[PDB]
Amino acid sequence: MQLSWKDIPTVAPANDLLDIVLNRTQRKTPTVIRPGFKITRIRAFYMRKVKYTGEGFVEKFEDILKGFPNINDVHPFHRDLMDTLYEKNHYKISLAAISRAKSLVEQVARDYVRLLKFGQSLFQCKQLKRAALGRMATIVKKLRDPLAYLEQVRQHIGRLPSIDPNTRTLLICGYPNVGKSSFLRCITKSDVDVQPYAFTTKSLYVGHFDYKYLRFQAIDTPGILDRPTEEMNNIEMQSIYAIAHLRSCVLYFMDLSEQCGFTIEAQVKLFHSIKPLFANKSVMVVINKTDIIRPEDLDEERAQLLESVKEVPGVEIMTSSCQLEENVMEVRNKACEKLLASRIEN
Amino acid sequence: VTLAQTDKKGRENKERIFDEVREALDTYRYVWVLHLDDVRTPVLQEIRTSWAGSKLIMGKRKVLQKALGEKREEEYKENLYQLSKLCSGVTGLLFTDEDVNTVKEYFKSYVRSDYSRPNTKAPLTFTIPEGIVYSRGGQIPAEEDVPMIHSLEPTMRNKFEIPTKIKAGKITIDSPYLVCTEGEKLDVRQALILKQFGIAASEFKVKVSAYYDNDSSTVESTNIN
Amino acid sequence: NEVKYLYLRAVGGEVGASAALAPKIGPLGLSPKKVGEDIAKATKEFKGIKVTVQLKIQNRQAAASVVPSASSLVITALKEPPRDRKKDKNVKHSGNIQLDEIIEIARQMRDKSFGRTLASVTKEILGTAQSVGCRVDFKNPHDIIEGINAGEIEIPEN
Amino acid sequence: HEERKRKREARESHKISERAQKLTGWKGKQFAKKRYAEKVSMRKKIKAHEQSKVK
RNA sequence: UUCAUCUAGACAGCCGGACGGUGGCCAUGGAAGUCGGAAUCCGCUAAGGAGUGUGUAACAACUCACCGGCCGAAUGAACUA
Ligand SMILES: [Mg+2]
């Protein structure tokens, strides 16, 4: 439950669930009733079978009903994971439909057992029990879509990394087309591709590294795109949400290299977009490939923009590269020290 | 089963082939007969653009024999039976009244790049350096080179089971392999290799060993290689 | 020295995408900013028009040229203003096509057209226009093929 | 494991003969219902494909 | 039983082809046919589907349906009891 919802028991389609419940009940219920019996025995047998079917359906539904947590209020500090993944409204509609069906099945069973209490003959009792079974079949067949959405939701949430919001953490973000996963590879151990693409990573990823005698976790942003500045896809919206609702120290990356996805054309727009969402989150900036771009010959025209950025107090730009194993360590140690200083002061 | 709109042609194709060949037999003066069986669609496009004043009409060997005459008694033109058994594979017919020497020189001198894969050949030795493979055989430098995908590795590990100059999947070999040698007869794996990258090591020309005249309408057959 | 031949497509009058052009200029080491400036200079003739840009490289020397495409030429034949609006979707130039621009759109491709004659080039262009689906000469493009076949519309040939 | 996948697909295709009789009863009816549903789906797909090809 | 193919060489298999306009148009950072929605033309043929699938992030490659060569008698599809 807490940051890990892998405990969902199992999901079957509506038709499969109906078939399973029906066959299991028909196997477990005695099937030998003769006319040479008093009406009490017949009534007892059929009441037992119908109530057992009702209880079986109720127990088959209650587990999945309780498995999914209160997504409206579970981690309001973070929230917004499965909605961002696929959707929220139709998900809640389907769950509410399942819950309504659960709240109606037992009422139908109680009403029908009350009606059949006054049964009189084998023909009429068989007919009414067949009617009850048909009502159950209809009310389980009228929810084919909710199970279909439920399967996808369960599969999506199964492979979801656990994130602890109320613990120490760090975040890495930057413009894509730079090899963002390289920091993850050089810091922690996991599986990711470093292909020369905008989307080096395709989802959120959390590390488990340990330095300064303590353990820390770093969250990688899949990427940032700000062409409309408001309307993105899941890849960018999840990153922007994580940046917004987290006070963890954030390291920002822009590629000041002649070879990149955007060259040097949109970093100013990046800074303008992030400044409203970068206020008290310990902004950190690094640059890669310094040993091959030679920052000693940087142009003053772009140095004016760098100074304009530096006008904001929380700006620090240095030279580092992932091709070595000294600059990366120094940068990470400085980030950890800044985090420690921030938490000591605050 | 089948889930496509395309269906079998039938025999109206055969009927229209008969009609077109019988009507086209009487269009120009000088018919054409050649010896070139296996070709490619770009080559057909090139030859048709060159010979637009002709007709690139061809069909089954049996139907061509039927049109030319299965017996001496029946014949569209005088001495058309010698053209029936003239060729055994696949060849077409043309009606060009341009010249003789010019067209023969065109045939003997034309050369294009393609793939042949013959049993007897004298090809250059082709090797696969290093463990990492390449799709062209390593001709361009590794700096400009590009990698490949190992998803189709079982295909080469089962059907090929040998390092390949062309059509190579990302594996590692302890030593380079000379997939091609001078004066060697290619096997199934060699025929499969040397096709992916399109590097046409083969030169295709026109080998002409056929002729026929219509005003003379008599026996004619050359042999030029 | 060595000559590199490659084909790329971009938007006229705009800087080429460095992310897409990175494999092309990877070993070359040329500046993608300079490449984008060259693309803009070469494609300034067409504004917001998707056309092909050449990248002729011989010992890493910039050389670009513009070669149009059939669909783009069909779009731009009417000379209608090309505009992109975030509030507009599924909008395209479907104005009536006169035979005056039919001759030009056949002639531009006739040099590289497989069809030997201007009639073949014109019928191929008519098939392309029927594929595109724009109105032609206040007439349905479907019937122009049979009109050509029956001689209803004559295409001058020289 | 492409050969393994192909063998699995062929075995699944040919398993209908083995599945012709299953259990001690009450399973042949389910198998018949599944076969009928598959046949109905195939007939509907064939009719739709023929209609699409026609017009 | 009905409807077909077949010496005017069928079904199975080996091998070859399956090309261009066109990466055809809206979603783009991706939609070459295959995460989607519309989408339905020719050029030259005997043949190539604005594409049934395998699946790459895309490409690519393979594969089917349709033709071609090898082998030369009867064979296919549906339905009935
Ligand atoms: Mg990366």
GROMACS .gro file of N, CA and C in nm, chain A residues 275-329:
model
  165
  275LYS      N    1   1.204   2.972  -1.435
  275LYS     CA    2   1.217   3.066  -1.324
  275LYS      C    3   1.092   3.074  -1.237
  276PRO      N    4   0.970   3.082  -1.291
  276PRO     CA    5   0.852   3.079  -1.203
  276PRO      C    6   0.842   2.952  -1.120
  277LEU      N    7   0.887   2.838  -1.173
  277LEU     CA    8   0.884   2.713  -1.101
  277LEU      C    9   1.015   2.681  -1.032
  278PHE      N   10   1.113   2.770  -1.039
  278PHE     CA   11   1.243   2.755  -0.972
  278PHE      C   12   1.260   2.874  -0.878
  279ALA      N   13   1.218   2.857  -0.753
  279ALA     CA   14   1.221   2.965  -0.655
  279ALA      C   15   1.305   2.931  -0.533
  280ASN      N   16   1.272   2.823  -0.464
  280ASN     CA   17   1.337   2.786  -0.339
  280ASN      C   18   1.368   2.637  -0.344
  281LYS      N   19   1.419   2.590  -0.457
  281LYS     CA   20   1.444   2.448  -0.477
  281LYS      C   21   1.592   2.418  -0.498
  282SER      N   22   1.681   2.509  -0.455
  282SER     CA   23   1.825   2.488  -0.459
  282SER      C   24   1.872   2.459  -0.602
  283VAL      N   25   1.853   2.560  -0.687
  283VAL     CA   26   1.887   2.547  -0.828
  283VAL      C   27   2.036   2.523  -0.844
  284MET      N   28   2.072   2.421  -0.921
  284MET     CA   29   2.210   2.389  -0.951
  284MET      C   30   2.226   2.373  -1.101
  285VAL      N   31   2.338   2.420  -1.155
  285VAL     CA   32   2.363   2.419  -1.299
  285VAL      C   33   2.500   2.360  -1.325
  286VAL      N   34   2.508   2.267  -1.421
  286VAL     CA   35   2.635   2.211  -1.467
  286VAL      C   36   2.635   2.207  -1.619
  287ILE      N   37   2.755   2.194  -1.675
  287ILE     CA   38   2.776   2.183  -1.819
  287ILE      C   39   2.868   2.066  -1.846
  288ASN      N   40   2.836   1.987  -1.948
  288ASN     CA   41   2.914   1.870  -1.986
  288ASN      C   42   3.003   1.901  -2.107
  289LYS      N   43   3.100   1.813  -2.130
  289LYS     CA   44   3.189   1.819  -2.247
  289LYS      C   45   3.274   1.946  -2.248
  290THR      N   46   3.308   1.997  -2.130
  290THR     CA   47   3.391   2.117  -2.122
  290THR      C   48   3.529   2.093  -2.181
  291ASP      N   49   3.586   1.975  -2.157
  291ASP     CA   50   3.720   1.944  -2.207
  291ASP      C   51   3.727   1.943  -2.360
  292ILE      N   52   3.613   1.928  -2.428
  292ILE     CA   53   3.611   1.928  -2.574
  292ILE      C   54   3.548   2.053  -2.632
  293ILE      N   55   3.478   2.135  -2.552
  293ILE     CA   56   3.424   2.261  -2.602
  293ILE      C   57   3.509   2.381  -2.566
  294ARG      N   58   3.604   2.366  -2.472
  294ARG     CA   59   3.695   2.473  -2.431
  294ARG      C   60   3.619   2.597  -2.387
  295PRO      N   61   3.565   2.599  -2.264
  295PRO     CA   62   3.490   2.717  -2.218
  295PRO      C   63   3.576   2.841  -2.200
  296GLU      N   64   3.706   2.829  -2.227
  296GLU     CA   65   3.796   2.944  -2.214
  296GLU      C   66   3.781   3.044  -2.328
  297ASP      N   67   3.713   3.008  -2.437
  297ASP     CA   68   3.694   3.095  -2.552
  297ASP      C   69   3.547   3.128  -2.574
  298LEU      N   70   3.469   3.134  -2.466
  298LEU     CA   71   3.327   3.162  -2.478
  298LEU      C   72   3.303   3.306  -2.522
  299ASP      N   73   3.199   3.326  -2.603
  299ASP     CA   74   3.170   3.456  -2.661
  299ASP      C   75   3.104   3.549  -2.560
  300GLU      N   76   3.140   3.677  -2.567
  300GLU     CA   77   3.084   3.775  -2.474
  300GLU      C   78   2.937   3.803  -2.502
  301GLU      N   79   2.892   3.784  -2.626
  301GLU     CA   80   2.751   3.806  -2.657
  301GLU      C   81   2.662   3.711  -2.578
  302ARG      N   82   2.701   3.584  -2.569
  302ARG     CA   83   2.629   3.488  -2.486
  302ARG      C   84   2.669   3.500  -2.339
  303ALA      N   85   2.790   3.551  -2.312
  303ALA     CA   86   2.828   3.579  -2.174
  303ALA      C   87   2.739   3.685  -2.111
  304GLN      N   88   2.686   3.778  -2.192
  304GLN     CA   89   2.589   3.874  -2.140
  304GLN      C   90   2.464   3.803  -2.090
  305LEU      N   91   2.415   3.705  -2.166
  305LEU     CA   92   2.300   3.627  -2.121
  305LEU      C   93   2.334   3.546  -1.997
  306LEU      N   94   2.455   3.491  -1.991
  306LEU     CA   95   2.497   3.417  -1.872
  306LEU      C   96   2.502   3.508  -1.750
  307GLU      N   97   2.551   3.631  -1.766
  307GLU     CA   98   2.550   3.728  -1.657
  307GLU      C   99   2.408   3.764  -1.616
  308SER      N  100   2.318   3.777  -1.714
  308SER     CA  101   2.178   3.805  -1.683
  308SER      C  102   2.118   3.692  -1.600
  309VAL      N  103   2.151   3.567  -1.634
  309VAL     CA  104   2.110   3.454  -1.552
  309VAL      C  105   2.171   3.464  -1.413
  310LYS      N  106   2.301   3.496  -1.406
  310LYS     CA  107   2.372   3.508  -1.280
  310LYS      C  108   2.315   3.618  -1.191
  311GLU      N  109   2.243   3.715  -1.249
  311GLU     CA  110   2.177   3.817  -1.168
  311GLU      C  111   2.084   3.754  -1.065
  312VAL      N  112   2.023   3.641  -1.098
  312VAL     CA  113   1.950   3.564  -0.997
  312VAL      C  114   2.050   3.501  -0.901
  313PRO      N  115   2.035   3.520  -0.770
  313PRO     CA  116   2.140   3.475  -0.676
  313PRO      C  117   2.170   3.326  -0.682
  314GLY      N  118   2.070   3.242  -0.706
  314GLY     CA  119   2.092   3.098  -0.704
  314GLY      C  120   2.144   3.041  -0.834
  315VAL      N  121   2.256   3.094  -0.883
  315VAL     CA  122   2.316   3.050  -1.008
  315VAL      C  123   2.463   3.019  -0.984
  316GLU      N  124   2.506   2.900  -1.024
  316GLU     CA  125   2.647   2.862  -1.019
  316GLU      C  126   2.678   2.773  -1.138
  317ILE      N  127   2.771   2.817  -1.222
  317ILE     CA  128   2.810   2.746  -1.343
  317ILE      C  129   2.958   2.712  -1.333
  318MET      N  130   2.991   2.584  -1.356
  318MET     CA  131   3.128   2.536  -1.347
  318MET      C  132   3.155   2.444  -1.465
  319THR      N  133   3.277   2.393  -1.472
  319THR     CA  134   3.320   2.304  -1.579
  319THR      C  135   3.327   2.161  -1.526
  320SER      N  136   3.263   2.069  -1.598
  320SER     CA  137   3.261   1.929  -1.558
  320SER      C  138   3.236   1.843  -1.680
  321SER      N  139   3.263   1.713  -1.666
  321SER     CA  140   3.241   1.619  -1.774
  321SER      C  141   3.218   1.480  -1.715
  322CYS      N  142   3.132   1.403  -1.782
  322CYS     CA  143   3.104   1.266  -1.741
  322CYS      C  144   3.205   1.166  -1.795
  323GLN      N  145   3.292   1.208  -1.887
  323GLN     CA  146   3.394   1.120  -1.942
  323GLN      C  147   3.503   1.087  -1.842
  324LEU      N  148   3.515   1.163  -1.733
  324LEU     CA  149   3.611   1.137  -1.628
  324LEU      C  150   3.537   1.096  -1.501
  325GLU      N  151   3.614   1.056  -1.400
  325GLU     CA  152   3.560   1.012  -1.273
  325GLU      C  153   3.612   1.097  -1.157
  326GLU      N  154   3.644   1.223  -1.185
  326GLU     CA  155   3.680   1.319  -1.081
  326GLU      C  156   3.586   1.438  -1.078
  327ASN      N  157   3.556   1.498  -1.193
  327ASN     CA  158   3.465   1.612  -1.197
  327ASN      C  159   3.325   1.572  -1.154
  328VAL      N  160   3.279   1.454  -1.196
  328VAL     CA  161   3.146   1.407  -1.157
  328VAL      C  162   3.138   1.391  -1.006
  329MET      N  163   3.241   1.330  -0.947
  329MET     CA  164   3.242   1.311  -0.802
  329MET      C  165   3.246   1.444  -0.729
   0.00000   0.00000   0.00000
